[PDB]
Design a protein around this ligand. Structure first.
Ligand SMILES: Cc1cc2nc3c(=O)[nH]c(=O)nc-3n(C[C@H](O)[C@H](O)[C@H](O)COP(=O)(O)OP(=O)(O)OC[C@H]3O[C@@H](n4cnc5c(N)ncnc54)[C@H](O)[C@@H]3O)c2cc1C
Length: 520
């Protein structure tokens, strides 16, 4: 009988398995559905940190196969297609297959968490957990940084920037933007070398960080790889264990405490199947109701993304002569409440022959939801990110595009004479209209955006921390699921809102914090 069964050996699951098992009396099982990634035998596609997009070139190999989602809000005169949503399926989860960038967001993100009912999750309260996770190679001795944590964070030196990146930076300075240097302790608009997590040229997932060999030899830690949890075992309103599929064999495992860390799309599907969710939905699926919690699978957040590409002209290609070089935090101007609501990257890829300015709404207004299609443990949920449902997000994307127009008009970048066209975010390519033309035609620009808006794999919020009297809350400040015993959620599902950040570093932090709450 395990004290803790942790379901999902991803970003959050890895931290929890490590921190909980640090006390020897704690018998802890970490169950991960995908392949193990032993530090001495990491798949070479995974292991290459300089080319972190490589896993997404192995098709399904490292993801949840055929996990499809709806992206944009349904809207008259557009037929939406389902879209494959990458989610890691292996030890380290998203941290094993992501683009290696590691940023925290803005104080205001977390102060809003507390304001929305997550007591002690304000900036003051999360910051120790950001410090504890990291070893910042550049600023680690400075006050808002850690120097001892398991996860390294570093940035390229600005002096190593390509002539192309420099030119972009001169363009941004011309618009009045500073180099803020450290996006993780400086929180106003400007540009910077992005903080990323690598070890030399190698990926450094949370499995490398939290589940190294010494941790693995702990007699009180069990690690089940290629093992899929199918159902939560209950008695009364108490979670009591898990049924797990290994080979063809299903096992029951008893547990004092189940902690779900199965990712923001699969953690709430597991709750819903257990009978924890909106009652009428569950009734509709013949699922007996443990707890009527209507926030389970609501409040699904993401960042809403788009691309601009241009063929590289000779000057630009010469100047563009792998690591994350440049990031831009900017304000759309669409809502006073949401400075720094846009993130942008400007760079060039001589390989595809494209210069790119890709960007997303980092502080969005739109949210969607996910539900079960049926009771089958094998089904994915029905997911609808509902992007651009709130018109402010459409406003933000248009603002971003104008900013790009403005920056590329600056002498430093206009000299290249790039003809910029719209593109999908995730695999940027030709085929979209010219930027200058679309910005001249508003309805056509609205239709394009609604049609081609993407995500940035920052799914979150589906089992939100909320106040103990909030009918729409799912978990309390320590991740305990309201209405049942024996169950916690401790992944990106619990974020009351997505931060102004890529979600990995915030997921590490929240797992450290939740581990602390448990150990305290
Ligand atoms: C392609 C991609 C690129 C990204 N780029 C970045 C980036 O550059 N920077 C950044 O900060 N964030 C980025 N993200 C997001 C970030 O990596 C995720 O938000 C983060 O990994 C979420 O962590 P988690 O623990 O919630 O989920 P995950 O790390 O996804 O972990 C969930 C784990 O649960 C396992 N699991 C699921 N269901 C079951 C089950 N029934 N049984 C057993 N195991 C199960 C999965 O196999 C997985 O290992 C990216 C994500 C993707 C997909």
């Amino acid at each position: 009988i395990f004290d803790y069964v942790i379901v999902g050996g991803g970003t959050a699951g890895s931290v929890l398995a490590n921190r909980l098992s640090a006390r020897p009396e704690n018998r802890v099982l970490l169950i991960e559905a995908g392949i193990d990634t032993p530090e001495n035998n990491i798949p070479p596609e995974i292991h290459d940190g300089l080319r972190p997009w490589l896993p997404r070139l192995s098709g399904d190999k490292f993801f949840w196969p055929n996990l499809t989602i709806h992206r944009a809000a349904e809207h008259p005169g557009i037929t939406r297609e389902p879209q494959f949503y990458e989610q890691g399926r292996l030890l380290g989860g998203g941290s094993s297959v992501n683009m290696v960038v590691s940023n925290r967001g803005l104080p205001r993100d977390y102060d809003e968490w507390q304001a929305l009912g997550a007591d002690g999750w304000d900036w003051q309260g999360v910051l120790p957990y950001f410090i504890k996770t990291e070893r910042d190679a550049d600023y680690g001795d400075d006050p808002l940084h850690g120097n001892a944590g398991p996860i390294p964070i570093g940035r390229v030196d600005s002096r190593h920037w390509s002539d192309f990146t420099v030119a972009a930076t001169q363009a941004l300075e011309a618009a009045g933007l500073p180099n803020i240097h450290d996006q993780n302790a400086r929180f106003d608009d400007g540009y910077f070398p992005p903080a990323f997590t690598l070890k030399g040229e190698e990926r450094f997932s949370a499995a490398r960080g939290y589940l190294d060999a010494s941790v693995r030899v702990r007699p009180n830690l069990s690690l089940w790889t290629e093992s899929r949890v199918l159902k939560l075992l209950t008695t009364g309103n108490a979670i009591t264990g898990v049924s797990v599929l290994r080979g063809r064999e299903t096992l029951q495992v008893q547990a004092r405490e189940v902690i779900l860390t199965a990712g923001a799309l699969q953690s709430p599907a597991i709750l819903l199947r257990t009978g924890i969710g909106p009652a009428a939905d569950l009734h509709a699926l013949g699922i007996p109701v443990l707890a009527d919690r209507p926030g389970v699978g609501r409040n699904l957040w993401e960042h809403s993304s788009i691309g601009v590409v241009a063929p590289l002209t000779e000057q630009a290609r010469a100047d563009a002569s792998s690591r994350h070089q440049l990031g831009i935090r900017a304000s759309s101007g669409v809502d006073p409440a949401t400075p720094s609501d846009l993130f942008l990257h400007i760079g060039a890829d001589p390989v595809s022959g494209l210069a790119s300015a890709v960007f997303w709404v980092n502080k969005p207004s739109s949210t969607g939801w996910l539900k079960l299609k049926d009771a089958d443990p094998f089904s994915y949920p029905d997911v609808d990110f509902n992007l651009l449902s709130d018109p402010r997000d459409l406003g933000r994307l248009k603002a971003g595009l104008r900013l790009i127009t403005h920056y590329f008009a600056a002498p430093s970048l206009a000299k290249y004479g790039l003809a910029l066209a719209l593109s999908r975010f995730a695999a940027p390519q030709p085929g979209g209209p010219l930027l200058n033309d679309l910005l001249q035609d508003e309805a056509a620009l609205e239709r394009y955006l609604r049609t081609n808006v993407g995500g940035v794999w920052h799914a979150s919020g589906t089992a939100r921390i909320g106040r103990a009297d909030d009918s729409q809350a799912v978990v309390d400040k320590a991740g305990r699921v309201y209405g049942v015993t024996g169950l916690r959620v401790a992944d990106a599902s619990i974020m009351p809102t997505v931060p102004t950040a890529n979600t990995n570093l915030p997921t590490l932090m929240l797992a450290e914090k939740i581990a602390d709450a448990i150990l305290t």
